[PDB]
Coordinates of all heavy atoms in Angstrom, one line a residue:
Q1 N 24.6 5.9 -43.0 CA 24.2 6.2 -44.4 C 23.0 7.2 -44.3 O 22.0 6.9 -43.8 CB 23.8 4.9 -45.2 CG 24.9 3.8 -45.1 CD 26.2 4.2 -45.7 OE1 26.3 5.0 -46.6 NE2 27.3 3.6 -45.2
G2 N 23.2 8.4 -44.8 CA 22.2 9.4 -44.8 C 21.2 9.2 -45.9 O 21.4 8.3 -46.7
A3 N 20.1 9.9 -45.8 CA 19.0 9.8 -46.8 C 19.5 10.0 -48.2 O 19.0 9.4 -49.2 CB 17.8 10.7 -46.4
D4 N 20.5 11.0 -48.4 CA 21.1 11.3 -49.6 C 22.2 10.4 -50.1 O 23.0 10.8 -51.0 CB 21.6 12.7 -49.6 CG 22.7 13.0 -48.6 OD1 22.8 12.2 -47.6
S5 N 22.3 9.2 -49.5 CA 23.3 8.2 -49.8 C 24.8 8.7 -49.5 O 25.7 8.3 -50.2 CB 23.2 7.7 -51.2 OG 22.0 6.9 -51.4
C6 N 24.9 9.6 -48.6 CA 26.2 10.1 -48.1 C 26.5 9.6 -46.7 O 25.6 9.4 -45.9 CB 26.1 11.6 -48.2 SG 27.7 12.5 -48.4
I7 N 27.8 9.5 -46.3 CA 28.2 9.1 -45.0 C 27.9 10.3 -44.1 O 28.5 11.4 -44.4 CB 29.6 8.6 -45.0 CG1 29.8 7.4 -45.9 CG2 30.1 8.3 -43.5 CD1 31.2 7.2 -46.3
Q8 N 27.2 10.2 -43.0 CA 27.0 11.3 -42.1 C 27.5 11.0 -40.7 O 27.3 9.9 -40.3 CB 25.5 11.6 -42.1 CG 25.2 13.0 -41.4 CD 23.8 13.4 -41.7 OE1 23.2 13.1 -42.8 NE2 23.2 14.2 -40.8
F9 N 28.1 11.9 -40.0 CA 28.7 11.7 -38.7 C 27.8 12.3 -37.7 O 27.4 13.5 -37.6 CB 30.1 12.3 -38.6 CG 31.1 11.5 -39.4 CD1 31.1 11.4 -40.7 CD2 32.1 10.9 -38.7 CE1 32.1 10.6 -41.4 CE2 33.1 10.2 -39.3 CZ 33.1 10.0 -40.7
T10 N 27.3 11.4 -36.8 CA 26.3 11.7 -35.8 C 26.6 12.8 -34.8 O 25.8 13.7 -34.5 CB 26.0 10.3 -35.0 OG1 25.7 9.3 -35.9 CG2 24.8 10.5 -34.1
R11 N 27.8 12.8 -34.3 CA 28.2 13.7 -33.3 C 29.0 15.0 -33.8 O 29.3 15.8 -33.0 CB 29.1 13.0 -32.3 CG 28.5 11.7 -31.7 CD 27.5 12.0 -30.6 NE 26.7 10.8 -30.3 CZ 25.6 10.8 -29.6
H12 N 29.2 15.1 -35.1 CA 30.0 16.1 -35.7 C 29.4 17.6 -35.3 O 30.2 18.4 -34.8 CB 30.1 16.0 -37.2 CG 30.9 17.2 -37.8 ND1 32.3 17.2 -37.6 CD2 30.5 18.2 -38.5 CE1 32.7 18.4 -38.2 NE2 31.6 19.0 -38.8
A13 N 28.1 17.8 -35.5 CA 27.6 19.2 -35.2 C 27.8 19.5 -33.7 O 28.2 20.6 -33.4 CB 26.2 19.3 -35.7
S14 N 27.4 18.6 -32.8 CA 27.6 18.9 -31.4 C 29.1 19.0 -31.0 O 29.4 19.8 -30.1 CB 26.9 17.8 -30.5 OG 27.3 16.5 -30.9
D15 N 30.0 18.3 -31.6 CA 31.4 18.4 -31.4 C 32.0 19.7 -31.8 O 32.8 20.3 -31.1 CB 32.2 17.3 -32.0 CG 32.2 15.9 -31.3 OD1 31.7 15.9 -30.1 OD2 32.6 14.9 -31.8
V16 N 31.5 20.3 -33.0 CA 31.9 21.5 -33.5 C 31.4 22.6 -32.5 O 32.2 23.5 -32.1 CB 31.3 21.8 -34.9 CG1 31.5 23.3 -35.3 CG2 31.9 20.9 -36.0
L17 N 30.2 22.6 -32.0 CA 29.6 23.5 -31.1 C 30.4 23.5 -29.8 O 30.7 24.5 -29.2 CB 28.1 23.3 -30.9 CG 27.4 24.5 -30.2 CD1 27.4 25.7 -31.1 CD2 25.9 24.0 -29.9
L18 N 30.8 22.3 -29.3 CA 31.5 22.1 -28.1 C 32.9 22.9 -28.2 O 33.3 23.6 -27.3 CB 31.8 20.6 -27.8 CG 32.5 20.2 -26.6 CD1 31.8 20.6 -25.3 CD2 32.7 18.7 -26.5
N19 N 33.6 22.7 -29.4 CA 34.8 23.3 -29.6 C 34.7 24.8 -29.8 O 35.6 25.6 -29.3 CB 35.6 22.7 -30.8 CG 36.2 21.4 -30.5 OD1 36.4 21.1 -29.3 ND2 36.5 20.6 -31.5
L20 N 33.6 25.3 -30.3 CA 33.3 26.8 -30.4 C 33.1 27.4 -29.0 O 33.7 28.4 -28.7 CB 32.1 27.1 -31.3 CG 32.3 26.7 -32.8 CD1 31.0 27.0 -33.6 CD2 33.4 27.5 -33.5
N21 N 32.4 26.6 -28.1 CA 32.3 27.1 -26.8 C 33.6 27.1 -26.0 O 33.9 27.9 -25.2 CB 31.2 26.2 -26.0 CG 30.8 27.0 -24.8 OD1 30.7 28.2 -24.7 ND2 30.3 26.2 -23.8
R22 N 34.5 26.1 -26.3 CA 35.9 26.0 -25.7 C 36.7 27.3 -26.2 O 37.3 27.9 -25.3 CB 36.6 24.7 -26.1 CG 36.1 23.5 -25.4 CD 36.6 22.2 -26.0 NE 36.3 21.0 -25.2 CZ 36.5 19.8 -25.6 NH1 36.9 19.5 -26.9 NH2 36.2 18.8 -24.8
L23 N 36.6 27.6 -27.4 CA 37.2 28.8 -28.0 C 36.7 30.0 -27.2 O 37.4 30.9 -26.8 CB 37.0 29.0 -29.5 CG 37.6 27.9 -30.3 CD1 37.3 28.2 -31.8 CD2 39.2 27.8 -30.1
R24 N 35.4 30.2 -27.0 CA 34.8 31.3 -26.3 C 35.3 31.4 -24.8 O 35.7 32.5 -24.4 CB 33.2 31.2 -26.3 CG 32.6 32.4 -25.6 CD 31.1 32.4 -25.7 NE 30.5 31.3 -25.0 CZ 29.7 31.3 -23.9 NH1 29.5 32.5 -23.3 NH2 29.2 30.3 -23.4
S25 N 35.4 30.2 -24.1 CA 35.9 30.2 -22.7 C 37.3 30.7 -22.6 O 37.7 31.4 -21.7 CB 35.8 28.8 -22.1 OG 34.6 28.2 -22.1
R26 N 38.1 30.4 -23.6 CA 39.5 30.8 -23.7 C 39.7 32.1 -24.4 O 40.9 32.5 -24.6 CB 40.3 29.7 -24.4 CG 40.2 28.3 -23.7 CD 40.9 27.2 -24.4 NE 42.3 27.3 -24.3 CZ 43.2 26.8 -25.1 NH1 42.8 26.2 -26.2
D27 N 38.7 32.7 -24.8 CA 38.7 34.0 -25.5 C 39.5 34.0 -26.8 O 40.2 34.9 -27.1 CB 39.1 35.2 -24.5 CG 38.7 36.5 -25.1 OD1 37.6 36.6 -25.7 OD2 39.5 37.5 -24.8
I28 N 39.4 32.9 -27.6 CA 40.2 32.7 -28.8 C 39.3 33.0 -30.0 O 38.3 32.5 -30.1 CB 40.7 31.3 -28.9 CG1 41.6 30.9 -27.7 CG2 41.3 31.1 -30.2 CD1 41.9 29.4 -27.7
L29 N 39.8 34.0 -30.8 CA 39.2 34.4 -32.1 C 37.8 35.1 -31.8 O 37.1 35.3 -32.8 CB 39.1 33.4 -33.1 CG 40.3 33.5 -34.1 CD1 41.6 33.7 -33.5 CD2 40.3 32.2 -35.0
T30 N 37.6 35.5 -30.6 CA 36.3 36.3 -30.3 C 36.5 37.6 -31.0 O 37.6 38.2 -31.0 CB 36.1 36.4 -28.8 OG1 37.3 36.8 -28.2 CG2 35.6 35.1 -28.1
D31 N 35.5 38.1 -31.7 CA 35.6 39.3 -32.4 C 34.6 40.4 -32.1 O 34.4 41.4 -32.9 CB 35.5 39.0 -33.9 CG 34.3 38.1 -34.3 OD1 33.4 38.0 -33.5 OD2 34.4 37.6 -35.4
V32 N 33.8 40.3 -31.0 CA 32.8 41.3 -30.6 C 32.6 41.2 -29.1 O 32.7 40.1 -28.5 CB 31.5 41.1 -31.4 CG1 30.7 39.9 -31.0 CG2 30.6 42.4 -31.3
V33 N 32.3 42.3 -28.5 CA 31.9 42.3 -27.1 C 30.4 42.9 -27.1 O 30.2 43.9 -27.7 CB 32.8 43.1 -26.1 CG1 33.0 44.5 -26.6 CG2 32.3 43.1 -24.7
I34 N 29.5 42.1 -26.4 CA 28.1 42.5 -26.4 C 28.0 43.2 -25.0 O 28.3 42.5 -24.0 CB 27.1 41.3 -26.5 CG1 27.4 40.5 -27.7 CG2 25.7 41.8 -26.4 CD1 27.4 41.3 -29.1
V35 N 27.5 44.4 -25.0 CA 27.3 45.2 -23.8 C 25.9 45.3 -23.4 O 25.1 45.7 -24.1 CB 27.9 46.6 -23.9 CG1 27.9 47.3 -22.5 CG2 29.4 46.5 -24.3
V36 N 25.6 44.7 -22.2 CA 24.2 44.7 -21.7 C 24.3 45.4 -20.3 O 24.8 44.9 -19.4 CB 23.6 43.3 -21.5 CG1 22.1 43.4 -21.4 CG2 23.9 42.5 -22.7

């Protein structure tokens, strides 16, 4: 129960980031190349 009386999921943000990194590893929906 969050401070705002809403149900909050503890691992949600870290799980979204994990999946975004999985998409990056597989080159899925990547839309830019940074050249250094």
Side-chain angles (χ1 to χ4, degrees):
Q1 307 299 330
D4 65 327
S5 294
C6 202
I7 299 159
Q8 191 161 335
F9 285 65
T10 311
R11 309 281 169 194
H12 180 71
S14 56
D15 282 349
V16 167
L17 198 60
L18 182 64
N19 285 343
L20 295 178
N21 198 28
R22 281 168 173 170
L23 295 180
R24 184 175 63 114
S25 300
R26 306 173 74 205
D27 200 36
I28 300 171
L29 264 45
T30 46
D31 51 12
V32 71
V33 57
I34 305 308
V35 183
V36 196

